[model samples]
Target: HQLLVGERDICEVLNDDTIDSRRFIGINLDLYKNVEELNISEKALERIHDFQFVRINGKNHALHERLQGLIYQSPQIRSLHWKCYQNICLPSTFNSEFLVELDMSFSKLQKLWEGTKQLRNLKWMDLSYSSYLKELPNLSTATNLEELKLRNCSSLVELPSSIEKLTSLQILDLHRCSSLVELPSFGNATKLEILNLENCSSLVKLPPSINANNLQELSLTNCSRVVELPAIENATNLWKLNLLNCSSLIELPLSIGTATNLKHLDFRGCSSLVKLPSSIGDMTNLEVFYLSNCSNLVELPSSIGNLRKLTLLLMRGCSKLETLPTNINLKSLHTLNLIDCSRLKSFPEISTHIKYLRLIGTAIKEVPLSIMSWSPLAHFQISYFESLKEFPHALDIITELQLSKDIQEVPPWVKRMSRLRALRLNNCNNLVSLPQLPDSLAYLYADNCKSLERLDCCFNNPEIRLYFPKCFKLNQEARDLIMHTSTRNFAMLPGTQVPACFNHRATSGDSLKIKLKESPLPTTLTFKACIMLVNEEMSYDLKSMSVDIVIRDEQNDLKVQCTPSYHQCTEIYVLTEHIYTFELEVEEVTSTELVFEFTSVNESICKIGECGILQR
Candidate 1:
């Protein structure tokens, strides 16, 4: 009690500048009776020798120099937290053999020690953000060390190979060690559980041999240069493995199937990978698998059906993949995506209970009628299937349907789909007309239908979103009929100029200023803009084109924001020959001085030709 009282009093004096801090440096701190903990400003730390716990904060250069000089005096310290220390160096002369934890984060430590030192009692050490550190000292002597964190150590290139000797070590984090090229073998650290090497871009390979039987999770995201993964067959307990954006990896080890406990596996953006081993089926417990953007992958093994518990499989943009296994038994599968599998010519008969299916950009000639029989089927999508000239029947129970192909007309059966709520049909170059739409439809997208000349639907109580961009052949009478019959929440079409009913109009620069002095503000304002392509790109690219319209007051308060586009199209070049009209509704406009600006989705590119605003 007496020692604690004296230490508190001393700290009070040190914290207060009423007394000079320099005078206390010459005074013997050892005179204090059994001080086990010390809290002092950098200037008051000189003879703090017997403390077991110490905390020092602040960045006075000369004062910190004197404080660093007193580090050796605290030979009994088991925990030390010093932030922003100057010219920091843990000199070998200092006896840190009994330290249990040490933190020197955000300090100027260029080196921790000059040579090997015994640290038998050290359990954890954190030197994160010590940017000048280039290499680590030998850690073989740290027999009891459990965790070492060196995150954001930008200059560190290699670690001591003897790290494998830390028998009791459990967690090692080297995230963002940008210069590290290779990892030393970790065979003896059997108890190691979690290892994170994320964002180590220069790392090319992991140790070829490892023996961490209890290892649970490993992350190597954005390690662009890693060509192959080390054998993790022995790491049976691993629950997740992420290899996202590892572009140079050519293959996954056959031993990956040995990790029977793996639940989530990601290979998104692994462009160089060409195939998956049949052994993948051995992971019976896998729930999610992502292989999006693996451009070269050609086929999946038939044994993939063995995953009885698999739930989601995403393989978008695997350009060369030709087909899926015909007899796969994904009993628990719910969602499957095969978008942009360009070389795929057919789809296998799926017996699993799938709720969602996407097959955009394939060559399938027909869809098996069995798909419409799945009790759980709710959503189906198919695009760019030039060979699919007709719609499949028995789709009355589906809630969403998307088809972009060469079909010349919408099947009359579509009007009978009582449960259909959404439909998207873009770039159907040959499509000429649509039948009466069902009353349940709430969202409709039919853009770039080059041959479409008319829409023949009337809604009695319509609450919907209708988009029909680039339907140039549709006559004014038909367009007028569509506008008058449907109750518009949102709609877009093509026209040559702003309508005569608009109160304010402009045919000028990229922006326009409007002044409104109406007594009662309009509840709904209709904004119209004439859009045209000034380049040579075809209708395909037009779908990706969009315009961002911003309406704000001089005070910079946003009044209305809208981004209108054809949606889901991207190509270079355009068609200066075509014209379009974009329309939007802004509710409850009250601002007096409003500024309207128009720019392409790429804000720098100007696209609008004329515009207007009308009160409804």
Candidate 2:
């Protein structure tokens, strides 16, 4: 039997002398609220197998502090998951030798157990986000442990030296342990496969070498002070290596070329990286090569052409990268980004199968007519037009086009792109008006066009997402068109209130509770919701916004039917009380006095101030 003890039944069960103590095997008090005081220390301590608790109402639960040292008495316990664990340390007499998995995340412990204990059955231990925990106990006997996660233990400076004895360890995560400076050599833990040490800001060095032949991943992202990486002689199985934002790293050892099985390598934001060894060409299986924002890198070796399986070469912000090897030819290359590489003069002429290319804000003087051979390139985004001797026929086939140039008017040929579906005009200074887009257009993004005042579209597409953020000068015609568009996805612009067209609307608050008086409610309904965004400087990403509408009976408040949850919307940011709107279709039944309320899916990452909903 499993017991879910609640506050009201505590005294009745605790005082009853006729109740069998060992009848229950699992006890959960996480949801049982406001117990003044209680204890099960002598009731069924030996028979319990699993127990879970969370001090949700904090110190208000008198039983919390009263049962301080009693939970460890469960001798047969296999798993203990306690959130916000209140104790500073386990009791000195604690003897739960059978504990298999212990997760006390968000705990307040400064230390674990004091003396070494046998942990033969323990396979996983996670104390992640335990902000105050400073150290671990001796794990010399925990040979069976496989996964240990101490992620975000911000104050943790060291791991027990005995961790190396666990030959069965496979995954060890120490992400964001900003106070750790170095690691003990993994001389005995040969089964270790994934080791993540990202954001360990104080770490300045690594063990001379690792002995784990099964090591497959090593992440050192944001370890800014580590100037050199240890040898990878035993990490032959390594397939992924991430070194993002390692600003002080100066070199990739010549031996890296021997990582034959390597498939993903990221060196982005490694500002001090000046060059790559020509031997890097030896990794034939290398697929995604990210060198974006490596500011000081000048060029790639001609031998880079040897990566026959390479698919993506992202070099968007590499300011000093001057050129690509003229002989380079990657057979699998399809996506290449070179945005803002100001010194790069010409686009690389390789990979005839390329499908996506972005070349906006480059110093390239002329586009080669050789681009005509890129038959697979259907997504093209660039800023230069006059530099093209003659626009290649390949561009005519583009389905998605984005331009970030300073121009007053879009070229007349834009409407002629028969298959164009998405169009973006980013930061086009002095641009005041837009022409009618193609009938197939489904997405229009016109961000930061400061002087934009007019827009023209026949509404050929039934479902389109339109955005005009920071276009402060939109005229009456453009404003009216945008307000009444009823787009299936969303339409964002500068506004202070819900348009008068919405039948159901409310003025001020993150919440609005109202009753629908419609007598004959239909089974199928269409709801159009809108919100007025506030606090521009503190705005969160709204790219994943979903519109959810809930309707229930006015009486006992029992959930009758919940229509399809919600629908995704667009990215919104900045402006004076910007308004975001989206429409959703759902189903329900008849009800006159129905209640409705609105709120965000997650308050953590959503910008909400005032909201209104329209029923149709």
Candidate 3:
């Protein structure tokens, strides 16, 4: 939205000195998108000394090679948003004391100024991805500045000696930079809310303390050189702190316990870390603790068990950890994932109810009897471990169950679980017969079961999604019941044969030529179109792939286009070398001699290798 100045008004502005720059048109120099660079008279550009808000509408992520020779002085500027603005330095012609916002991201600036400039009114400043920028000028007087972003400034090794002088600075994002060996003190930046310095691998240390009470999140991920964190003594509003991949970090600050409002704490991959502060119990609201692979952390604080609101404890790869706190009982906790902690020998305790508890490869030999009776627990995912025997006792409460070990037979116990709805079994190499599933079951997955020969289960559920890829040894009894039932949606295993009931068949192409007797036409035609799709990846839940029914007649030459009462093939289409059967009912007439041809069911990627139609 712009106010276009007519040629009459535009000409007057250039002629009269009293007429302010506001009377001039906001120029769109994008005709440069029409090939070469266009020029404006350099003398005319110098006369207009003030541009309050200039929006140089250039090409998207503009290519600077065409260097439009248009330039204007904007000492009277308020906001300048010029992305990909390639310039060595801004024009020194006028005073930029009135500048409020300046954006020069993706600019080719080697330097902005020789020293400090008067940017007191500047509130927002962004120079992100300016790879050539080596140093920043002092904004010592910009006490009103709120946000300063220098993300991806690869060549920037150091910031201005001091930016904490500004009380209004709220966000300081300095991520993906290089060689920032150390940082200046951040003691006076009390209003700052988010300070991001992620991936500054060479940053050795931060300030001794970040006392910003308004700060909500602080991330220093992949800052491998950072051995210690700055004390966050008064950052009470801080909720999330991500120190992921800071391999050299050893301990948390004893002062962090005072930040009671902290919620999500991510310390994953902190290899050199040894312990957390006992003060951590003071963060009672803390939830979702991510300490995935801190191999050196041997124990949790005994006081940590007191955080009743804590949930989702992920200690998947903490190999050096052996046990939990003696008083461990996090009531609100759910989904305690302890996947590959090889040294964990004894069973851990949860005071009360929980769900989605996964224990893959721990050293524990048994599950305590207490876990079986926990009524609130719903699903259990156990894999690649030893004598895990408690699944039998929790049948009433457990609704979804998953197991991945190799057992020749599925347990008969599964049918008794009246509440069961879904089951997934992976890589069970010797399983030959699938047991009779419960009436309540809605989804069953038995993948990579190499020797499975029969599906003995009764599919009483009105709707089911049964996928059994790579179980090619399944006998005809299993494959026949899969097809004849015609459920709502399901993907059968890959095969080359179609059912014998489909009388009209095409061996090679997607079409079938039929010679019919006109007297034998039905009140309504239901075409059970069986299609064979090309084999590739496993793709299901397909409301995709339809067909064209071009009824070209021969006896009385005419092409009759038959429209259906509704779209026929709307049920399911599995993307593999499987024959997908869909019933398409066409509503009108046809001749005695006709070609019942099917064309383009996603031709190349989804070639209809063979197709058949059963008319009823």
Candidate 4:
């Protein structure tokens, strides 16, 4: 017979096993709250206490201070579970060779561990979801441990460097352990199977090891700064890997192809990755893949189609992907989800094995009529496509259809669907009318189509529920007829202050036109004065003059060209007029938007080059 204690009751049951030595064998206390405190005492331990597994779980078990005495007496316990309140602290001392599993989850215990190294036979330990647990002790003594789960322990700050001693560890789940700053060296874990560090927002680096042969599953989701992966050849047994939300990872090593046993790979929300290694085709055993939310991933390697065993591929929210490879022999592929990939412009020739396909937020043109070969098409979401002309050819077999885009008229393929039960088409931007929909369409949403001028087609089926959200924008006819309707506030852009030259005027045209002509200085012998034409067409003609006017003959270090002065808009550098024509096109104009540059004063002192114009 087994003794059980609930949260409300802790009555010890009489057992025959305790008759020999006056000790209990098993005390099953699953989610049982305690009312009193118990300290580590020989008296309490002597009271029928040969228990192997002692569990005290629940929200508020009052017996915290009392368990210490019970554990101190019967230090032979194998497994233990302790759940304590906020301020309650328990004595931590257990000397047992058979204790294999221990759970102190959801507690306010802030220390790393007051009694961690004492356990020599602990195989599994979980301190996860402990909101107030802050530090971690070096577990170099745990030589036989296999799995450790510390997920959702937000206050956890650091891990001791002695974790490398766990050579027998297989799984280390630290998901949502946000404050973990760094991981221990994992180079020597020859038997390590799974390592999950998902949502470890503060983890800055991993062990820089080149050998992780037995590591199979690794997840780094929402770890923003984990930039690079270790060499792939070292992790030959790696099948499942996740680097989702790793925004700082920019590149992958080409050695990734060496991991031939890779099955599931996820890079969702990794916006910084630019390209994939071409050697990825070497992963022949790949099954499930996810590249969703990769906003900047523009292209994939052509070798990606070599994965013959791929089953599910999700590229949802990959906004920058423009095209996919057409050549794929994916005979086992089933589901292909492409939700919210807003910039997806084209699709490669897809195969018939694709059963469930979703193209939400795509801007595609048309589905190939050749898709009629896909008899397995069950679900579809072809929506928000601004230029889509026709539906997929196998719409008759689709069980769920969501057609929402700018297309005003529904194509004949949707009208002929006999199996579709749920239909939702909301925010069709250019949809001004509706077509005859089948009675199989049970759910519909046509809200936000303000231009929907007509919906004369009947959807009077009893099972169908046509819903329009309360905040829907109505059509112009309805808006104009309703006096109490709320209208959108149209903001007018303020008029720009026009420049003096931009003001269109009749008399200004001739003055601006003559500005391009060479006045010849009226007399070349007298002091020359010339005005410049700065208009769009005439301005550039004056720049053609290659006039080498000597601005400063006194200062040997100082010289200037006839180009515009820095202080004024015109290229009117003061120079002696005798050396050249006042209005000569010094150089043939090359560009339209003329930026009359004043040649550097020091550069002008150099001997002038051969002039193709009139040389004085």
Candidate 2 colliding pairs, count: 0
Sort the predicted structures by TM-score, highest score first.
1, 3, 2, 4
Off by over 4 Å in 2: 1-219, 231-235, 384-389, 392-394, 508-537, 540-544, 550-565, 574-576, 583-599, 604-616
Query: What would the per-residue lDDT of candidate 3 be over residues 232-303, giving only the tens digit for each residue?
Result: 767677876899998988888897877778888888888978888898888868888898888988887888
Model 3 scores worst on lDDT over the 10 consecutive residues at: 28-37
Cα shift from native, residue 200, model 2 (Å): 5.1
Whichever of 1 and 2 has more TM-score, that candidate is 1
Which candidate wins on lDDT?
Answer: 2
lDDT (Cα atoms) of all candidates against the true structure? 0.69, 0.71, 0.69, 0.57
Q: Report the candidate with higher TM-score, 1 versus 3.
A: 1
Residue by residue across 67-153, what tens digits does model 2's lDDT show? Answer: 443356545666777666666776676565787788877677899888888898898998898888888998888878889999899
lDDT of 1 by residue, 312-379 (tens): 88988888988788866678888888887888888755555887877677666676766555656666
- Best TM-score among the predictions, by candidate number: 1
Worst 10 residues of 2 by lDDT: 52-61
